[PDB]
Coordinates of all heavy atoms in Angstrom, one line a residue:
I356 N -21.8 2.7 9.0 CA -20.3 3.0 8.8 C -19.5 2.0 9.6 O -18.4 1.8 9.3 CB -20.2 4.4 9.5 CG1 -20.9 5.5 8.7 CG2 -18.7 4.7 9.6 CD1 -20.9 6.9 9.2
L357 N -20.1 1.4 10.6 CA -19.3 0.3 11.2 C -19.1 -0.9 10.4 O -18.0 -1.4 10.3 CB -20.0 -0.1 12.6 CG -19.0 -0.8 13.6 CD1 -17.8 -0.1 13.7 CD2 -19.8 -0.9 14.8
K358 N -20.2 -1.2 9.7 CA -19.9 -2.3 8.7 C -19.1 -1.9 7.5 O -18.3 -2.8 7.1 CB -21.3 -2.7 8.1 CG -21.3 -3.4 6.8 CD -22.4 -4.6 6.9 CE -22.8 -4.9 5.4 NZ -23.7 -3.7 4.8
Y359 N -18.9 -0.7 7.2 CA -18.0 -0.2 6.2 C -16.5 -0.4 6.7 O -15.7 -0.9 6.1 CB -18.2 1.2 5.8 CG -17.1 1.8 5.1 CD1 -16.8 1.5 3.8 CD2 -16.4 2.8 5.7 CE1 -15.7 2.1 3.1 CE2 -15.3 3.4 5.1 CZ -15.0 3.1 3.8 OH -13.9 3.6 3.1
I360 N -16.4 0.2 7.9 CA -15.0 0.3 8.5 C -14.4 -1.0 8.8 O -13.2 -1.3 8.6 CB -15.0 1.2 9.6 CG1 -15.4 2.7 9.3 CG2 -13.5 1.4 10.1 CD1 -15.3 3.6 10.4
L361 N -15.1 -1.9 9.4 CA -14.6 -3.2 9.8 C -14.2 -4.0 8.8 O -13.1 -4.8 9.0 CB -15.7 -3.9 10.7 CG -15.9 -3.4 12.1 CD1 -16.8 -4.4 12.8 CD2 -14.7 -3.2 12.9
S362 N -14.8 -4.0 7.7 CA -14.3 -4.7 6.4 C -14.1 -3.7 5.3 O -15.1 -3.5 4.5 CB -15.3 -5.7 6.1 OG -16.5 -5.2 5.5
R363 N -13.0 -3.1 5.2 CA -12.7 -2.1 4.2 C -11.5 -2.6 3.4 O -10.4 -2.7 3.9 CB -12.4 -0.8 4.9 CG -11.9 0.4 3.9 CD -11.0 1.3 4.5 NE -11.2 1.5 5.9 CZ -10.3 2.0 6.7 NH1 -9.2 2.3 6.2 NH2 -10.6 2.1 7.9
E364 N -11.8 -2.9 2.1 CA -10.8 -3.5 1.2 C -10.4 -2.4 0.2 O -11.3 -2.0 -0.5 CB -11.3 -4.8 0.6 CG -10.1 -5.7 0.1 CD -10.7 -6.8 -0.9 OE1 -11.8 -6.9 -1.1 OE2 -9.7 -7.6 -1.4
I365 N -9.1 -2.2 0.0 CA -8.6 -1.2 -0.8 C -7.7 -1.9 -1.9 O -6.8 -2.6 -1.5 CB -7.9 -0.1 -0.2 CG1 -8.8 0.8 0.6 CG2 -7.0 0.8 -1.3 CD1 -8.1 1.9 1.3
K366 N -8.1 -1.7 -3.2 CA -7.5 -2.5 -4.3 C -6.4 -1.8 -5.0 O -5.5 -2.4 -5.6 CB -8.5 -2.8 -5.4 CG -9.7 -3.7 -4.9 CD -9.1 -5.1 -4.7 CE -10.3 -6.0 -4.3 NZ -9.8 -7.3 -3.8
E367 N -6.1 -0.4 -4.7 CA -5.0 0.3 -5.3 C -3.7 -0.3 -4.7 O -3.6 -1.1 -3.7 CB -5.1 1.8 -4.9
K368 N -2.5 0.1 -5.3 CA -1.4 -0.5 -5.0 C -0.6 0.3 -3.9 O -0.1 -0.4 -2.9 CB -0.3 -0.5 -6.2
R369 N -0.6 1.6 -3.9 CA 0.2 2.4 -2.9 C -0.6 2.5 -1.6 O 0.0 2.7 -0.5 CB 0.6 3.7 -3.4 CG -0.7 4.5 -4.0 CD -0.2 5.6 -4.8 NE -1.4 6.4 -5.2 CZ -1.7 7.5 -4.5 NH1 -1.0 8.0 -3.4 NH2 -2.8 8.2 -5.0
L370 N -1.9 2.3 -1.5 CA -2.7 2.6 -0.4 C -3.4 1.2 0.1 O -4.5 1.3 0.5 CB -3.8 3.6 -0.7 CG -3.4 4.9 -1.3 CD1 -4.4 5.5 -2.3 CD2 -3.2 5.9 -0.2
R371 N -2.7 0.1 -0.2 CA -3.2 -1.1 0.4 C -3.0 -1.3 1.9 O -3.8 -2.0 2.5 CB -2.6 -2.3 -0.3 CG -3.5 -3.4 -0.6 CD -2.8 -4.5 -1.6 NE -1.6 -5.0 -1.0 CZ -1.5 -5.8 0.0 NH1 -2.5 -6.4 0.6 NH2 -0.2 -6.1 0.3
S372 N -2.1 -0.6 2.4 CA -1.8 -0.7 3.9 C -2.8 0.1 4.7 O -2.7 0.2 5.9 CB -0.4 -0.2 4.2 OG -0.5 1.2 4.5
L373 N -3.9 0.7 4.1 CA -4.9 1.4 4.6 C -6.1 0.6 4.9 O -7.2 1.1 5.3 CB -5.4 2.6 3.8 CG -5.4 3.9 4.4 CD1 -4.3 4.1 5.6 CD2 -5.2 5.0 3.5
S374 N -6.2 -0.7 4.5 CA -7.4 -1.7 4.6 C -7.4 -2.4 5.9 O -6.5 -2.3 6.8 CB -7.4 -2.4 3.4 OG -6.1 -3.0 3.1
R375 N -8.5 -3.1 6.1 CA -8.8 -4.0 7.2 C -9.2 -5.3 6.8 O -9.7 -6.1 7.7 CB -9.7 -3.3 8.1 CG -9.1 -2.1 8.8 CD -10.2 -1.5 9.7 NE -10.4 -2.3 11.0 CZ -9.8 -2.0 12.1 NH1 -8.9 -1.0 12.2 NH2 -10.0 -2.8 13.1
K376 N -9.1 -5.7 5.5 CA -9.5 -7.1 5.1 C -8.8 -7.4 3.9 O -9.0 -6.7 2.8 CB -11.0 -7.3 5.0 CG -11.4 -8.3 3.9 CD -12.8 -8.4 3.8 CE -13.2 -9.0 2.4 NZ -14.5 -8.6 2.0
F377 N -7.7 -8.2 4.0 CA -6.9 -8.6 2.8 C -7.2 -10.1 2.3 O -7.0 -10.9 3.0 CB -5.4 -8.5 3.2 CG -5.1 -7.4 4.2 CD1 -5.1 -7.7 5.5 CD2 -4.8 -6.1 3.7 CE1 -4.8 -6.6 6.3 CE2 -4.4 -5.2 4.6 CZ -4.5 -5.4 5.9
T378 N -7.7 -10.1 1.1 CA -7.8 -11.5 0.4 C -6.4 -11.9 0.3 O -5.6 -11.3 -0.3 CB -8.6 -11.3 -0.9 OG1 -9.9 -10.8 -0.7 CG2 -8.7 -12.7 -1.4
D379 N -6.2 -13.2 0.6 CA -4.8 -13.6 0.5 C -4.7 -15.1 0.1 O -3.5 -15.7 0.2 CB -4.2 -13.6 2.0 CG -4.5 -14.9 2.9 OD1 -5.8 -15.0 3.2 OD2 -3.7 -15.6 3.3
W380 N -5.7 -15.8 -0.6 CA -5.6 -17.1 -0.8 C -6.4 -17.6 -2.0 O -6.3 -18.8 -2.4 CB -6.0 -17.9 0.4 CG -6.1 -19.4 0.4 CD1 -5.2 -20.3 0.9 CD2 -7.2 -20.2 -0.2 NE1 -5.7 -21.6 0.6 CE2 -6.9 -21.5 0.1 CE3 -8.5 -19.8 -0.6 CZ2 -7.8 -22.5 -0.3 CZ3 -9.3 -20.8 -1.0 CH2 -9.0 -22.1 -0.9
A381 N -7.0 -16.7 -2.7 CA -8.1 -17.1 -3.6 C -7.7 -18.0 -4.7 O -6.6 -17.7 -5.3 CB -8.8 -15.8 -4.3

């Protein structure tokens, strides 16, 4: 669960502010 929470990426549009790892440069 720690590995899940520390790097949790959400792809939906309205719930993106709920994540903890944002891809920003690909």
